[PDB]
Symmetry: C5
């Protein structure tokens, strides 16, 4: 229309985009900064970066962009693109990405009385600190530091508005708790400029259904089969075969885990200790099995038990586990044959109790290793704080 | 020509690209928005993004870009590049990508009467929600939210036209069902501006031939060999060897699966339950085999059956499975030799029935584990909705 | 020089880059479009994109960029950068990449009589259809659709010139066959504008030496060792050990293959069927071995053969394979000892023929499984079209 | 305000951004360059690049950007964007990235007396030299070369200020030691221009808790089980089974290691030697086991010991390890039976000492291989310099 | 200063950046092109691209950028940014990257007499041909084609200067040999324009310490253990177990190798043949072991040797390897017992020589397979040209 064309001509008349729109060059310009979280794109522990899709709202007041409604009746608001009107230089301080702005400058709405609002969308990649302790059951606090880069305390008075979460599109992996904020001003090394800033911190809780079922559940089941060695009879030459196959089949899990675990020397993660515990329990099973096996094939008539094994593994431990354990030359020739058989029976009896001792050790170690696994798995998981709420929410 | 050069000079005379081309600054400008799907580039479940190659069509009416055909006979249409004429700021609301526009501004056609049409091509990366439940047999609905960013209800009246699918170049992985749309206007927190938008939703069905043959078919075959342990004789020291090798060879499948499965704690995927079922069936086979093995090498003369095994596994279960099961000193020396052989026969007979009990258990568990696998594999697959149509289309 | 400086001043005088350089605004401008293939960067089956490094040649005639050689003797040609003279908007229709142009605008040569030629280099990422059937022995046809975006039939008459392949730098993986082209014009949904285009199709043949030697050759060799189970004696408790280790060692190949195979449900690839055939042949070997093993450790005196096995595996199949298969009490005590030995001999004879039956089955299955593998491997490879030429070229 | 609008108009009056702001064109312009390290993004050994998030500070003095405070009372400082005032062209010399600047030009503060300061933020990817020797316990020195590109010694006198580390946000993987710097000027091949530069070197120490626990600790434990072969009795046919399974299960570690190790032929890394030592120790265990096994199943009555084994492995080594090791025809028939049994006893005795020799070798090799592993693991780790401080800090 | 401000004003007066700075428009402009290699970023065989960080030097003479030193005493040189003075359009012809220039336009130095020099830094990604034959011991020649894009022979006379390598920062993986160059002009299809160019070829030698130690050394060691099967006694049921475990553990190496090997069907790489040789040697070991095993468990009394084995493996091969290899009824009952034992001895003797034949074959195959491995490993490595220099440099 003729009024819109006319109004745009006075508005850009003698206008300098490099100038603060303050009427008096002695008072700071009040700028209201807010934030709207639309979704959490991804949280990557390896690079310790946080990708979020958010909206920004910068609102200030202009003095030269004012006009009377009566003179121009039809038009009420005007829009100016980037590079034609003064805008605040508020930007993310972290900005862990190649290009540092990440704001996608759009049109800037202008009031009928000079109140200018700016609503740019962008995808931000901030530098967060992923404290990976109690990894499946961890809560992360990520900060977003926003503030002006060239305007100090007396030039741009940065104010704060509460963050908006109307429309969040939940990720499904991380459960958002809340996004509080804070406004403060600090003194930097360069200058005597007190620089205000707005720091929005994001608190999110990691869901545990995927990690618990795909990682924690198989570990208990695989470790259970390593406990099944003591139930196999020693006759079947198969004890070490299943003893070492489970160990080989269980080292593969940290290969997946280490691909996700950041290589940070802050603290030993809970998942790292739990896997390490399974290494030792399965590893010590093979060592015990070797001791059991040599008790079976002891090659008798080559050394008797030192009389401590006859009383420990056959009287004390056994009670606990309810084991309950021309004719003259013809005669001489037959004499040797029967005596040889008699000596074979004596050797068999000596070897028989050697095998029974191995059975006692196997059964004794089964009870000892079983209670170790029960308290090791439970004890580590119980130690994690807020473990109960995650189970009560994700699982139950 | 001289007419084209002349016409371009009046057209750009006193023209402001920042002004809405409405003749009266009281009525909204009617803008027709449509869409044309050219192909689906890729659907990624891990990042929950949808990459599509589409075309856009924005058509509106201009008031200052009008001329008489008689005055300029040769020229009928003119084209203006970006930044020289007013264009709507319609953009994708989701825009899950670094740069937010993704439109590749091109020349804008102009009528002889002021009807301006704009047809920019681009590759869009929207943020979709991949509900991964019944993963091989899932249907995904992806939304595309388009609308103006700075013009409200009274400024830009956004209209809708039906989506165009003339030329789709089918992906081969996802089967397109349809792309319906909707026009609505909502109230936002910033302003009293009712903002219209056009939301095009894309419904696609995942094809199952690749996932069924490369993932589902081998799982049945590998689980079948784990069922073959009960057919192996216990004499060959090879039962646990094949019992645990199949288990080791079958854990590798979720390694491929987890690399594709998004780590979302929304619901347990169908493929996750089916793999978990195979874990337990194969895992319980090793536990049963250990019980069977200790029934074989029972070391007789160390405890008889409690008289419940003589009647259960030898009379009840066996009937079900059709098993059907100087001279005086010379005489004394020969007396011991024959008696020793007689005692060996008695011990062999006792051990013989111990081995037969193990054979009954093996055969009994073969029948029980077979029907479990048949109903577990079928039962999980039947539970998925629209399973029949995918088989009737992709396979048959 | 003074003439070059003077000439540039009249040339840009009253020049509008938005105007078609036609002298009469009623006839289309003839634009000659060609192509020069410099190399094929990469063909990716997963994303179905084709990356090529090519050159473009757009040549048209300008009316305002003309001058007399006599007036300016030294200068014969002039060059204008992008944004200063009118250029056609020909662009790739597919453009499967983030930015859509991929042309790297350079200087544009200008004749002494107005004939303007434009030779921009670029790397193009078109969207091809990789029909992966007979994957090692496949020929792919990739199209490149070029045409104007804003100028119709009556505005820009797009012509065609033959593609140039002078200098190709062969890739070494794909063998180029030829690059023919076509010029046609179609009617689109938007407008009554008949839009001409030039479609250059690229035909390339995949070389087979790498895929044949690294993938096809090991498969035959590994499957051969799975056939070696029937030659192992049943006494050595090692038949299932090598039966299942080969199967475990052979599942790893599709892990490499599936990483290359696109997940397209168009048709079952030849390499997929060939691997699936090896699964069944190796898988059925373990099933046969279990049947053979239970024929060995049959535990005699627990059931005789049903008299069909005595005649089938011992008379019919065996002929085919050339198998050819006080004193009174002293006497009574010795009577039992000899009779016990006699009964042992009878039991050994019964078990002896049980073992021989297992040997016959093993040898019989070796002949049957051998011919199956020979015709399965050859039969699948022969079915692929143009298999002979690839072997005659890549190998021989 | 009116004063800010007025001041900006004289400041940009007759101003050339291509001109050095020196009042006299005979003296170099003094530019103060500093640096502020905010965090270390990532150190990648494969590409030998160092990604850091740092801030820059370039401060110089301008002669034309001066004004009187009395004339313009309200305004004290002004800001000019890029491309409107002269700025130094200081840039990173290494710049191992696609775009070479990586500075994100921002507003430039201006004094009331002409002192201009410039504080651009950016993420820099310099080309470092990762000397990977003693890899878990290494200290890296990375250089950052900054200097002007077009201004020589007499044009831009580049000065140096101490680096700032107020706020570092420690990475958790690398421990920062310090960031010293240096200012020097060199003569280049192009010109007689002495070019000053500022080289900031970054010294960081890699933390060892993650690499020690996830890589070094399992290696000792896995190598311990390879040492357990000599404790297994030779009767259980399981020595090679555990001998070769550990070797198969231990080759997988360099697969993870080689994925991290850069392929640089500078020196053999400490982790490479330590893994290579474990290869030989585990590998030689299988060779020894084969020698031990053939001493067990020696098939007696086929060769006696050469009388050196009777004295070495049975008298010398055994003492070290405390081993301590009608009637006539009736008579003739019984004569053979007893003599046959007597010959069996003699053969058993000969085979008995053959088995005992294998037991001595097994035990002897257990002592020899144990001390080898203890000194090989400790000896390699001790050789690394500053090994003690890393253990005293990261672990203790 | 006032002189610098004044000089810049005449210099840009009536200056056209589109014009060649030649005083006479009949002679070509002499442009000197050189190169400085700073480092080799990476050489990637899969994509056949070469990433290098180099500097360029373009020097020409300008006619309009001249001034008298006396008139302007202080200033001696001036700098003009991109887009304000004429510059040559020399660019890399290969440019295997998204953006085609890769030059990072900087300030351009100007003499006091018109000699203009241009020194832009950049990271170039050229398209090289990696002839992967004798892969660990290969030398690659990579070309860099530089030349003008729009100026022909009579317009821009491109000259050449020797490449500079003062400061190379050796990569550590590739050993630079030299960078020679060449200047030539060719006739293209478009035009009668003879286009000069400068082609700098880079010759680099790959270092072998990393590839030799991490890949070649383990292959010899793993193949050695596959040769240890023939030393294992056949009694221990463990020959196939170690025979097939080594084969399973050795297929994993090409998985790493194929991830590095480009899929080019040019020639069979040396590393491919060496791995293929190890496949057959290890593979044939299992086949021989099966033949040996069936010679052990021959089940005697079921066929004698054909009298060729008695003379070949027991007389010829054995000599080579130094093997050296009421009363009447009482009497009748004892008669059978002794005769049964006598028949057992005869059967044992027949089986004894069957086992000895297997021992001869095992030992005979050990000698034959050992010399095969020695000449196969050495023979392949010796065939590679310049193998000796790499060992003499990288290793010794
Ligand atoms: O209403 C809005 N944005 C709409 C206006 N335009 C049209 C649709 C929407 C996006 C652009 C709002 C955006 C933000 C951002 C940060 C903080 C707050 Cl409190 C708000 S409220
Ligand atoms: O001759 C040429 N290009 C040269 C001219 N300049 C200098 C060297 C070369 C590149 C730039 C040609 C380029 C093309 C492109 C497409 C089709 C055809 Cl038939 C041709 S012929
Ligand atoms: O001297 C130089 N470059 C310095 C000048 N400026 C300041 C420091 C350096 C980089 C910019 C040189 C650069 C090149 C490039 C190619 C060939 C040659 Cl023979 C040379 S000589």
């Amino acid at each position: 229309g003729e009024f819109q064309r006319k109004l745009y001509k006075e508005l850009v008349k003698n206008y300098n985009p490099l100038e603060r729109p303050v009427a008096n060059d002695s008072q700071p310009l009040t700028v209201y900064f807010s934030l709207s979280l639309l979704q959490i794109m991804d949280v990557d522990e390896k690079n310790q970066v946080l990708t979020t899709n958010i909206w920004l709202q910068m609102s200030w007041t202009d003095h030269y962009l004012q006009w009377n409604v009566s003179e121009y009746p039809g038009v009420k608001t005007v829009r100016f693109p980037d590079g034609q009107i003064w805008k605040p230089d508020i930007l993310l301080y972290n900005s862990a990405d190649e290009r540092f702005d990440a704001t996608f400058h759009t049109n800037v709405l202008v009031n009928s009385s000079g109140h200018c609002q700016y609503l740019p969308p962008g995808i931000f990649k901030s530098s967060c600190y992923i404290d990976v302790r109690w990894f499946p059951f961890d809560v992360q606090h990520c900060k977003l530091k926003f503030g002006s880069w060239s305007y100090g305390g007396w030039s741009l008075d940065l104010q704060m508005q509460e963050a908006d979460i109307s429309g969040y599109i939940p990720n499904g992996e991380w459960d958002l708790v809340g996004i509080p904020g804070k406004r403060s001003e600090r003194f930097y090394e360069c200058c005597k400029e007190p620089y205000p800033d707005v720091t929005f911190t994001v608190t999110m809780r990691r869901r545990t259904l995927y990690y618990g079922l795909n990682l924690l559940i198989p570990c208990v089941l695989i470790s259970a089969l390593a406990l099944l060695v003591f139930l196999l009879p020693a006759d079947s030459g198969e004890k070490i075969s299943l003893g070492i196959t489970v160990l080989l089949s269980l080292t593969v899990f940290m290969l997946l885990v280490a691909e996700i675990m950041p290589a940070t020397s802050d603290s030993v993660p809970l998942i790292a200790q739990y896997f390490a515990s399974t290494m030792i329990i399965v590893g010590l099973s093979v060592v015990v099995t070797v001791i059991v096996l040599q008790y079976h094939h002891h090659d008798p008539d080559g050394g008797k038990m030192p009389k401590w094994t006859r009383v420990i593994l056959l009287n004390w431990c056994a009670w606990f586990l309810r084991m309950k354990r021309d004719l003259a030359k013809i005669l001489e020739e037959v004499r040797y044959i029967a005596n040889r058989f008699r000596c074979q029976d004596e050797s068999e009896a000596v070897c028989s109790e050697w095998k029974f001792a191995a059975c006692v050790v196997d059964r004794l170690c089964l009870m000892a290793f079983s209670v170790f696994t029960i308290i090791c798995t439970i004890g580590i998981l119980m130690s994690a704080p807020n473990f109960v709420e995650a189970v009560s929410k994700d699982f139950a």
